[PDB]
Every structure is written in C-alpha cells, then in structure tokens.
Design a binder for these strands. Structure first.
Length: 497
DNA sequence: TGTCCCTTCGCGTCTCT
DNA sequence: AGAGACGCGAAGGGACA
C-alpha cells in the first residue's frame, strides 16, 4: 500500500481476492468502490467480519455491506452497525434498511451512536417522527445535525416562526448543523434588510452548503439587484440550489459579459445559473456559445435550453462533441440531439444513445424514432439500458407489445416504471382483474412506479377510503394524478365520509 | 492515513398538473 | 407535459490524531 511498508501489497490483494469468494461474492466494481472511499482498512474490516455482518442477527446483503464500508471511517461504521443494529431495530422501530442508510455516510459511527442516544427525546420532547430523525441522521455530519436540531428546534419554531417540517428540511443536508445556525443568525436580517420571506430563507438553507448560500445572499443580493437590475425573486432562485454561493458569484462576474458580448437576456442567465452546478453551466456557455452557433450549429435559445439543467456543463460539452457523429452516422436531426440533451444527465443519455441506437434496433427491433423518444427524458441512460434488459421478458412472458414497453420507457423514471410493471403485472391482472391495457396506462406517466405501488397497496390490503371507488375508478385516478391522487383520496375520506 | 465534517457537482426520479 | 421540486452518490477540501 502507501510508502511506509512494502510488497505485502500481496497480503491486501489476497484479502480483496477472498472477498470475491463467499459469503459476499463481491465483484470488481464493489471492491473498487470500497477502496476509493473507505480505504484499505475498510476493505480489511469487511473481510474480518464478513460472516458476522452476513449472519448473526444482522443478515445484511452484500450491497448493504458495501454501502456501509464505502465511506471515510467505514470500519467504524461496520463495527458500530454490528453493535447497534438490533437495538435500533427492536427498541426504536427502525428497519434494517434505515439503519444501513444512517450508517452509509462518512462518520456513520457517530450518526448511529447519536440516533441511539437522541431519537427518543427528538420524538418525545420535540414531536418529530422516527422517519424525520432518520432523514436528519442520513447525511455526513449527522451527529452534529441531530444535536443541533435538539438545541435549536425550539428557538427556530418560537422566536423565528418556522415549522418542525421546515427545521427538519434545513437539518436533512450535509452541514445541516451549519445551515441551521446560519438560519438562526441571518433569517431576521434577510427578511428585514432585503425583503425576503421566511419561506425563501428556508428554500435557500434547505440544500447542502446552505450556510454559504445564505451568507452569499446577504453579501451579493444588494449588488445584484441595485447594480445589475435583478429582482429579489430571481436572486433567491439562484440561491435555492446547492452550490448557490458559486452560482451567485459567477452570475455577478459573467452577467454583463453574457448580456453585452453574447446577447442573452438577464432572465436567461438566471435560468442557466438556477441549477446545481450553475457556476459550471455559466462558464461553459460563455465558452461554447460562439462555437455552437458556428457551421450554422444551433440557435442561442437551444444552447440555453441545454445548459438549463443540473450538469448543464456536461450536456453542452457532450452535445458539442457528439452532435456531428450523431447527426452524420446515425441520422438524427439537431432538433433531436438537443431534445436528448435538454434533461438532467443529458450527457449520460447522449453517450447511451451513442452505443445503443445500433443495438436496440438490431437485437430488439426498435426504430430510431422510438430510441429517441426514450432518451429525450431525464434518466435516458436508465430507460434505454433497461428497455435492453427487460423488453424480452415483458413481451414474451408477460405478453406486452414492444410499442407498450416503449410507451412506459418514454417518461422520466422509465426504468422504475418498467421494473415495477414486471414485478406487479401478475398480481394486478390475475389476482385483481385489471387488464394489461390498464396497468400499462398507469405505468405510462411520470411517477409510474409509485402509482403502481399505491394501487397494489390499496387493492392487496383494502385501505381505509373504501368500496365506492371500484377498480376502474382507482385506475382512472392513478392515471390522472398518480400516487398524489391516490393519497389525496385517502386523506379526504379520513375526516369527511 | 484514518475519521469526521462540510461543500459542490452531477445524475436520476417524481410532483405539479 | 415542462418546469420545478424531491432524493442521493461521488468526489474533493479542511481539521485533527
């Protein structure tokens, strides 16, 4: 390993080799993930207690052991999981998955030990739910956030008017301690001195690095409104993503350069700046906006639409590289390439449309225009890669037409909807009498997976809001508004009927 | 060279309808 | 149905032992 000892790197490669054996049966990716973030002592820990973790009263899966191990301090997390999982599960209600989610962060040990110590008082003195305490705990520095919720949730509720839900939302990010103390320190000035509402201070504080975003809003909002012409509402939208501090500083530096030298509106720079990596997006359009309207290329409108998503930098740089070979050796129009790239993870969708247009048409019989409709949604790579795995079993075994698989894959969260259809098509049809036509219709929207799960939960275990919504009304509800429609129906019955 | 905490970037999914 | 919201992993940086 590192320079200190020697050539018993062999002892470590042997330890890594035995983890490929049983009871964990780890592959290369998994060993690589552990060594890149938990280090050698995490690898050594997994190996030392791979039997204890896999049996005894923990019964962890290898993916579960790999999630706990693959963080700074992983060996402490694995040690502590073995000591605390049972009492957290049995004495406090939490599931194993929830204990693993608390454990799967840097400092995992501290978080688990603190939930043990603080979950009761947080629930009893402050009225939080187990669920909320897990969400506070499940981030790096979760010990600190938990202790800070316990000290400040009273003052933030009383003196500053927030709800617990709100405090929990500021608390449920890495550096949630920092965000929560900054909210206490700056909330009144941000409202009183810059005309913000508590809700906006909250939205700015509710992401990681929220401390930084709030200090930066205090600092640059004046210069950005009073000297660059922006509104308070616009500044807040820039500030309301993690990295907001970077997005605001970059707006200030590039706003006049982009509005004079390249001809964009302020309102368009605001839209590029208002995503995660806004700083990265802005710089990358400031390069690249000359060359992307060259050879003809694209409009400005289309550069802004591609940049206006998380990872905007990545989509532009990828679009700029692959628009030539996509238009020329696969037959796509730029209007199609920009449509692939104008979602979250546009980069990922383009690279998968690269090496799957050929393959999806050949080994599965799809047209190009189908492969484009799949990849023209957020999570393109996931939908395409999962159409490739699951089309065979969905048509042949479960009876579906390919055009039906493609209707389900052609929405954000496609892979979730497909993997749910497969899991839940049998129990929906044969045990509850829904047609495949109806299941496909619920699956064919945003929120296909939750809509299918909620419908099966309502049917399998007749929930409280009962009877009058027959099986066809529930399907009409699941189609119209997904899980939200289904839950609103439940919630409205509970007090009215 | 490990353990803890904090910040930023990017990817994926769901809600709002 | 397009924008705006939710979640969460990877990675990098600083403090301290």
């Amino acid at each position: 390993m590192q320079w200190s000892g020697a050539r018993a790197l062999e002892a470590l490669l042997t330890v890594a080799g035995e983890l490929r054996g049983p009871p964990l049966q780890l592959d290369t990716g998994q060993l690589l993930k552990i060594a890149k973030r938990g280090g050698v002592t995490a690898v050594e820990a997994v190996h030392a207690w791979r039997n204890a973790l896999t049996g005894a009263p923990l019964n962890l899966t290898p993916e579960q052991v790999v999630a706990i191990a693959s963080h700074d301090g992983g060996k402490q997390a694995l040690e502590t999981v073995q000591r605390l999982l049972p009492v957290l599960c049995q004495a406090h209600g939490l599931t194993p998955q929830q204990v693993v989610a608390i454990a799967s962060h840097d400092g995992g040990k501290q978080a688990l030990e603190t939930v043990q110590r603080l979950l009761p008082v947080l629930c009893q003195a402050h009225g939080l739910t187990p669920e909320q305490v897990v969400a506070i705990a499940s981030h790096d520095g979760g010990k600190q956030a938990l202790e800070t919720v316990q000290a400040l949730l009273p003052v933030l509720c009383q003196a500053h008017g927030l709800t617990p839900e709100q405090v929990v939302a500021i608390a449920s990010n890495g550096g949630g301690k920092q965000a929560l103390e900054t909210v206490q320190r700056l909330l009144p000035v941000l409202c009183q001195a810059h005309g913000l509402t508590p809700q906006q201070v909250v939205a700015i504080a509710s992401n990681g690095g929220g401390k930084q975003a709030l200090e930066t809003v205090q600092r640059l909002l004046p210069v950005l409104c009073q000297a660059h012409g922006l509104t308070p509402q616009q500044v807040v939208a820039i500030a309301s993503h993690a990295g907001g501090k970077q997005a605001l500083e970059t707006v200030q530096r590039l706003l006049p350069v982009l509005c004079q030298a390249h001809g964009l509106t302020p309102q368009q720079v605001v839209a590029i700046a208002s995503n995660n990596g806004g700083k990265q997006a802005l710089e990358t359009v400031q390069r690249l906006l000359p060359v992307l309207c060259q050879a003809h290329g694209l409009t400005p409108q289309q550069v802004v639409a591609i940049a206006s998503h998380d990872g905007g930098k990545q989509a532009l740089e990828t679009v700029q590289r692959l628009l030539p070979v996509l238009c020329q050796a696969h037959g796509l129009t730029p209007q199609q390439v920009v449509a692939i790239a104008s979602n979250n993870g546009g980069k990922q969708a383009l690279e998968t449309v690269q090496r799957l247009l050929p393959v999806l048409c050949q080994a599965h019989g799809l047209t190009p225009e189908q492969v484009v409709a799949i990849a023209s949604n957020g999570g393109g790579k996931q939908a395409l890669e999962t159409v490739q795995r699951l089309l065979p079993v969905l048509c042949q075994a479960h009876g579906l037409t390919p055009e039906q698989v493609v209707a389900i894959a052609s929405h954000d969260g496609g892979k979730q909807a497909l993997e749910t259809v497969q899991r839940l098509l049998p129990v929906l049809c044969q045990a509850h009498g829904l047609t495949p036509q109806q299941v496909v219709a619920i699956a064919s929207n945003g929120g296909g997976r939750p809509a299918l799960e909620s419908i099966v939960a309502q049917l399998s275990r007749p929930d409280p809001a009962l009877a009058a919504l027959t099986n066809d009304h529930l399907v009409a509800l699941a189609c119209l508004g997904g899980r939200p429609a289904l839950d609103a129906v439940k919630k409205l019955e509970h007090h009215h009927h």
